[PDB]
Design an enzyme around this catalytic site. Structure first.
Site, short mmCIF file in Angstrom:
data_model
loop_
_atom_site.label_atom_id
_atom_site.label_comp_id
_atom_site.label_asym_id
_atom_site.label_seq_id
_atom_site.Cartn_x
_atom_site.Cartn_y
_atom_site.Cartn_z
N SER B 178 0.83 -1.20 0.00
CA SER B 178 0.00 0.00 0.00
C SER B 178 0.86 1.26 0.00
O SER B 178 1.91 1.31 0.66
CB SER B 178 -0.93 0.00 1.21
OG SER B 178 -1.79 1.13 1.20
N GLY B 179 0.43 2.26 -0.76
CA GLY B 179 1.16 3.50 -0.86
C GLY B 179 2.38 3.46 -1.74
O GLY B 179 3.13 4.44 -1.79
N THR B 183 -2.02 3.46 -7.65
CA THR B 183 -3.09 4.31 -8.17
C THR B 183 -2.54 5.39 -9.09
O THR B 183 -3.15 5.71 -10.12
CB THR B 183 -3.86 4.94 -7.01
OG1 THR B 183 -4.18 3.94 -6.04
CG2 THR B 183 -5.15 5.57 -7.52
N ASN B 219 -0.43 5.33 3.94
CA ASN B 219 -0.49 6.32 2.87
C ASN B 219 -1.73 7.18 3.06
O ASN B 219 -2.75 6.71 3.56
CB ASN B 219 -0.51 5.65 1.49
CG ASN B 219 -0.44 6.65 0.36
OD1 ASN B 219 -1.20 6.57 -0.61
ND2 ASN B 219 0.48 7.61 0.47
N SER B 222 -4.94 6.28 0.19
CA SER B 222 -5.12 4.84 0.30
C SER B 222 -6.47 4.45 -0.27
O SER B 222 -7.51 4.84 0.26
CB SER B 222 -5.01 4.39 1.76
OG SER B 222 -6.22 4.63 2.45
N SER B 223 -6.45 3.67 -1.35
CA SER B 223 -7.69 3.12 -1.90
C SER B 223 -8.24 2.05 -0.97
O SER B 223 -7.49 1.29 -0.36
CB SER B 223 -7.44 2.54 -3.29
OG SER B 223 -6.89 3.52 -4.16
N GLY B 440 -3.41 -2.39 -2.15
CA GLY B 440 -2.11 -2.96 -1.89
C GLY B 440 -1.99 -3.54 -0.50
O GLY B 440 -2.81 -3.30 0.39
N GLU B 442 -0.82 -4.15 3.25
CA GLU B 442 -0.66 -3.17 4.31
C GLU B 442 -0.64 -3.89 5.65
O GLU B 442 -1.25 -4.96 5.81
CB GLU B 442 -1.77 -2.12 4.27
CG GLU B 442 -3.18 -2.71 4.18
CD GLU B 442 -3.74 -3.12 5.53
OE1 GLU B 442 -3.25 -2.62 6.56
OE2 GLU B 442 -4.66 -3.96 5.55
N1 LIG Z 1 5.05 8.00 -9.98
C1 LIG Z 1 4.82 8.80 -8.95
N2 LIG Z 1 5.09 10.12 -9.06
C2 LIG Z 1 4.84 10.91 -8.00
N3 LIG Z 1 4.34 10.60 -6.81
C3 LIG Z 1 4.08 9.28 -6.74
C4 LIG Z 1 4.28 8.35 -7.73
N4 LIG Z 1 3.90 7.09 -7.30
C5 LIG Z 1 3.47 7.28 -6.08
N5 LIG Z 1 3.57 8.58 -5.67
C6 LIG Z 1 3.16 9.10 -4.37
O1 LIG Z 1 3.14 8.00 -3.49
C7 LIG Z 1 1.97 8.07 -2.63
C8 LIG Z 1 1.12 6.84 -2.86
O2 LIG Z 1 0.82 6.68 -4.27
P1 LIG Z 1 -0.59 6.03 -4.63
O3 LIG Z 1 -0.66 5.74 -6.09
O4 LIG Z 1 -1.68 6.85 -4.02
O5 LIG Z 1 -0.51 4.64 -3.85
P2 LIG Z 1 -1.60 3.47 -3.75
O6 LIG Z 1 -1.83 2.95 -5.13
O7 LIG Z 1 -1.00 2.43 -2.86
O8 LIG Z 1 -2.82 4.11 -3.17
C9 LIG Z 1 1.32 9.43 -2.93
O9 LIG Z 1 1.89 10.43 -2.09
C10 LIG Z 1 1.75 9.67 -4.37
O10 LIG Z 1 1.74 11.04 -4.73
MG LIG Z 2 -3.94 3.10 -4.17
#
Ligand SMILES: Nc1ncnc2c1ncn2[C@@H]1O[C@H](COP(=O)(O)OP(=O)(O)O)[C@@H](O)[C@H]1O
Ligand SMILES: [Mg+2]
Lengths: 50, 857
Positions: B178-179, B183, B219, B222-223, B440, B442
């Site tokens: 997770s995080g 997403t 995170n 978090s979805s 993800g 966690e």
């Molecule tokens: N490629 C990326 N570029 C910038 N920030 C990213 C990137 N991947 C993840 N982050 C940062 O990491 C954190 C979690 O990403 P996120 O996609 O929301 O995770 P999850 O899919 O687990 O919910 C957020 O703060 C997001 O902005």
């Molecule tokens: Mg997510």
């Protein structure tokens, strides 16, 4: 195609072999009909009168 | 530096600079004098070579510390030519320190995207980098991963190239803790699809994001539900109708939020007071602290400004075409849920006596009904024998929470259905590409049934990756009659899944006890301990810690040991409700509440639905050609650039990326059908496989390959698919493109040759005409200088030659005109004759038709 989605159908050996047979039958029937149309076109010359 | 110029801003963040590799080649190195040695706080450390006493090589670490260790855990460093390598399959030495250190080297240069064999790995940068510009997306169109820097855009482009070429479905699956950034990468994939309705898909993700995500310890974004986004394409190779499917939204979030965990985004987006109209029509202030359901969390995130999120989701709703009435309806429902959260009850002689009903009246007004009827339904529930029953005061609060979470779930499903309806378009759609982003893995301080479901989904996704990458590939090697020793890479998660998924397992016992009435946590847990404790490797006694909350048991996922305290999971899986309030909500004034909720009483445990959805989803996925992306979180502190070695080592071990790269470099990654290979690469040696002179696939392909003067030990010929050693397919594609360029250039040369040939034939005719003209004018001058010629040659044609010489000219021209007229008349007569033959043809056809109507009667 069901609705607007092209869904692949799963069939066993019996269905696929029967499908092959049906394809053969249909293509040979179209063969025969095309032959009939061709001979009709060749024989149906000008002045088919009276 | 064509790639550098094309990429521009993102070029230094995606590709190593030319001077960087030039100085990297000059870095001191040797076959010896370079090793990686294990260490406690940092997993692996670079070190030199000192002495090998009795086989105990002595290594001087980069920190200056020196220790001698046996030949075990002694791995040679890779040459500097492989520093910050784009694809990690061409490493001459592959070992656990090597993957970590190449990943760290790329991370230091902010190169998050890296290819590990066939699939891809993305490290969380925790900082939005300028690489997702539309210029980079356009640059990533129609390009192989070999010829382009690693990026999710290149992954989507390769998936689309397969989509077009082999006419088969693709599935981009994102997996990780997770995080880690699943997403975000899903959003980038949808962006790449949109660039190459597009606004609809772009804004659909924030619409569901505003209602699904919540801030957690792991995170902030978090979805709480799995997403499957299917983008359909027609035969022409263009975007078509889309679809979005959700998996098991965590409904317990509205009722309770952890101390460090916030509530859903929308409940504070509306209360950010960006639009006071929302506050006015919802009869709600901008302070969530007055409202029990949504006041448990911090309601404040440093990186999140709820006003901006609220305006963004409103803009997304407008873009999707959300009418004002339905938006107001869901806003009223969202107000009503914490209005329900405001409920208070007291015991007085037995059913709790309602009090503070003004908020209940406001909620009933928002949903639309008689407030007294809803109060009585909550105060005195009636269920199937409608019969009243005495129940405790605490139970009415639980009933209200269950109703609120059910309403939220139905509203979420309505949003999903509305998104499907808006995105659906009747234009033809042939195949589909499925992007999968599950919740993800966690590890919260305290974990419950929803945490178990999310971790089980992650477990099953990891097991599917193991089965496809390792087991199915080796079985494909075996079946096609290719010599290959069976290799066990050491991860088979089927046992861990069957610990809970299969009947009589922990999850199965959960549904069985849920069906069982009067089910208690104490007894049911006992039913777990005698069933799988000890005898199941993953399940064990709880490794309870004083700081952590008391846990009933602890079980081992692929990602480590996790404690799982059960507290009333039976009620959560059962989801009981009060039928009286169900009937009241069914006939509510509001369109949303009336239509959505009427099917509750119009059972199946939600865990069973979860299992069935996972099974159906993965059975559908098996029909597709997956592209895997594995996301790694570097540091738990959300600090960009901090590359915490032990955490990444644990994640790499649990993911098993190393064995995937091993099976990519050792086995045969590229497999192509004999007929496809023949029709594709015939240009290399057109002399072989003559055009339509025989019927054979294996022999023709073997001749073609044997005429390609390459390492013939790379490919092992199979029954139906010829296999390729790693890196061979790209080479053959390179020679195919070069041969095609040669053919095109020779075509241009031949076309120039023929154009010159015809123009020079025309020049020949022009020169002959010029010679004729010049000779005639020379003769005319020669006769014109003669005084005699003009006198009797300029008046004779007008007068003397008119009556008996020019009359041949007149008769000739009139013959020509008459012949033209006769030919035109005869042609018209012939076309009229064939036309009247056609008239006979159609008239006898019409008599046949007349016979047809006499048949009809
Ligand atoms: N490629 C990326 N570029 C910038 N920030 C990213 C990137 N991947 C993840 N982050 C940062 O990491 C954190 C979690 O990403 P996120 O996609 O929301 O995770 P999850 O899919 O687990 O919910 C957020 O703060 C997001 O902005
Ligand atoms: Mg997510």
């Amino acid at each position: 195609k069901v609705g607007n989605e092209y869904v692949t159908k799963g069939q066993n050996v019996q269905q696929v072999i029967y499908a092959t047979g049906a394809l053969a039958k249909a293509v040979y029937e179209r063969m025969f009909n095309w032959m009939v149309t061709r001979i009709n076109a060749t024989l149906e010359t000008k002045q088919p009168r009276q | 530096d064509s790639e550098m110029a094309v990429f521009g801003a993102a070029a230094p963040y995606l590709r190593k600079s030319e001077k960087e590799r030039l100085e990297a080649q000059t870095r001191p190195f040797d076959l010896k004098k370079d090793v990686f040695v294990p260490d406690d706080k940092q997993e692996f450390v670079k070190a030199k070579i000192v002495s090998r006493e009795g086989g105990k090589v002595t290594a001087e670490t980069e920190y200056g510390k020196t220790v001698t260790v046996k030949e075990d855990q002694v791995m040679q460093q890779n040459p500097p030519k492989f520093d910050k390598i784009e694809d990690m399959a061409m490493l001459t030495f592959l070992h656990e320190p090597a993957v970590l250190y190449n990943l760290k080297d790329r991370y230091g240069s902010w190169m998050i995207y890296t290819y590990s064999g066939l699939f891809c790995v993305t490290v969380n940068p925790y900082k939005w980098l300028p690489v997702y510009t539309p210029e980079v997306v356009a640059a990533y169109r129609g390009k192989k991963r070999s010829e382009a820097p690693p990026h999710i855009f290149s992954i989507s482009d390769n998936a689309y190239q397969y989509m077009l070429t082999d006419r088969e479905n693709q599935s981009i699956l994102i997996t990780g803790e997770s995080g880690a950034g699943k997403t975000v990468n899903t959003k980038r994939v949808i962006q790449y699809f949109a660039v190459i309705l597009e606004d609809q898909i772009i804004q659909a993700n924030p619409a569901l994001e505003a209602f699904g995500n919540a801030k957690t310890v792991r995170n902030d974004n978090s979805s709480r539900f799995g997403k499957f986004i299917r983008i359909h394409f027609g035969a022409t190779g263009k975007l078509a109708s889309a679809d979005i499917e959700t998996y098991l939204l965590e409904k317990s979030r509205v009722i309770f939020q952890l101390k460090a965990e916030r509530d859903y985004h929308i409940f504070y987006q509306i209360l950010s007071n960006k639009k006071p109209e929302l506050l006015d029509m919802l009869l709600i202030t901008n302070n969530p602290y007055d409202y029990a359901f949504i006041s448990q969390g911090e309601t404040t995130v440093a990186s999140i400004d709820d006003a901006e999120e609220l305006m963004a989701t409103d803009n997304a709703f407008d873009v999707l075409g959300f009418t004002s009435e339905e938006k107001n309806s869901m806003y009223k429902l969202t107000g009503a849920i914490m209005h329900f959260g405001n409920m208070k009850f007291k015991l007085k002689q037995e059913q709790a006596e309602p009090d503070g009903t003004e908020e209940a009246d406001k909620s009933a007004y928002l949903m639309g009904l008689n407030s007294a009827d809803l109060l009585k339904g909550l105060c005195h529930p009636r269920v199937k024998v409608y019969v009243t029953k005495g129940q405790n005061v605490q139970q009415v609060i639980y009933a209200t929470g269950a109703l609120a979470k059910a309403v939220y779930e139905r509203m979420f499903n309505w949003m999903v259905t509305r998104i499907n309806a808006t995105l659906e378009t009747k234009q033809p759609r042939q195949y589909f590409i499925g992007v999968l982003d599950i919740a993800g893995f966690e590890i919260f301080d305290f974990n419950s049934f929803e945490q178990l479901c999310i971790n089980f989904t992650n477990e099953k996704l990891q097991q599917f990756f193991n089965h496809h990458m390792f087991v199915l590939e080796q079985e494909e090697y075996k079946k096609e009659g290719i010599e290959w020793t069976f290799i066990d890479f050491g991860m088979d998660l089927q046992a861990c899944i069957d610990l809970i998924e299969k009947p009589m397992g922990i999850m199965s016992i959960l549904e069985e006890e849920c069906m069982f009435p009067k089910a208690t946590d104490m007894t049911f847990k006992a039913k777990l301990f005698d069933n799988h404790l000890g005898k199941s490797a993953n399940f064990q006694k709880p490794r309870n810690i004083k700081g952590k909350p008391e846990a009933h048991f602890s079980l081992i996922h692929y990602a480590g040991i996790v404690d799982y305290n059960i507290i009333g999971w039976l009620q959560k899986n059962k989801d009981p409700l009060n039928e009286t309030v169900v009937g009241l909500y069914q006939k509510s004034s509001l369109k949303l509440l009336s239509t959505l909720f009427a099917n509750y009483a119009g059972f199946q445990t939600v865990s069973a639905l979860h299992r069935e959805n996972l099974n159906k989803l993965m059975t559908n996925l098996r029909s597709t050609h997956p592209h895997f992306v594995r996301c790694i979180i570097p540091n738990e502190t959300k600090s960009p650039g901090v590359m915490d070695n032990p955490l990444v080592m644990h994640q790499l071990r649990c993911n098993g990326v190393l064995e995937g790269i091993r099976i990519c470099r050792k086995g045969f990654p590229n497999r192509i059908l004999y007929g496809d290979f023949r029709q594709r690469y015939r240009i290399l040696n057109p002399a072989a496989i003559p055009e339509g002179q025989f019927i054979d696939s294996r022999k023709g392909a073997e001749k073609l390959l044997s005429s390609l003067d390459i390492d013939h030990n790379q490919y092992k010929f199979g029954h139906t698919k010829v296999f390729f050693k790693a890196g061979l397919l790209g080479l053959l594609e390179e020679m195919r493109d070069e041969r095609l360029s040669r053919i095109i250039t020779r075509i241009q040369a031949q076309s120039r040759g023929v154009l010159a040939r015809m123009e020079y034939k025309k020049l020949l005719e022009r020169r002959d005409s010029l010679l004729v003209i010049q000779w005639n004018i020379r003769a005319f001058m020669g006769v014109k200088n003669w005084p005699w010629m003009k006198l009797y040659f300029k008046i004779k044609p007008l007068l003397k030659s008119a009556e008996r010489e020019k009359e041949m000219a007149s008769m000739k021209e009139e013959f020509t005109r008459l012949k033209e007229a006769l030919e035109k008349s005869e042609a018209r007569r012939k076309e009229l004759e064939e036309k009247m033959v056609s008239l006979l043809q159609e008239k006898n056809d019409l008599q046949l038709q007349v016979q047809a109507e006499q048949d009809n009667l």
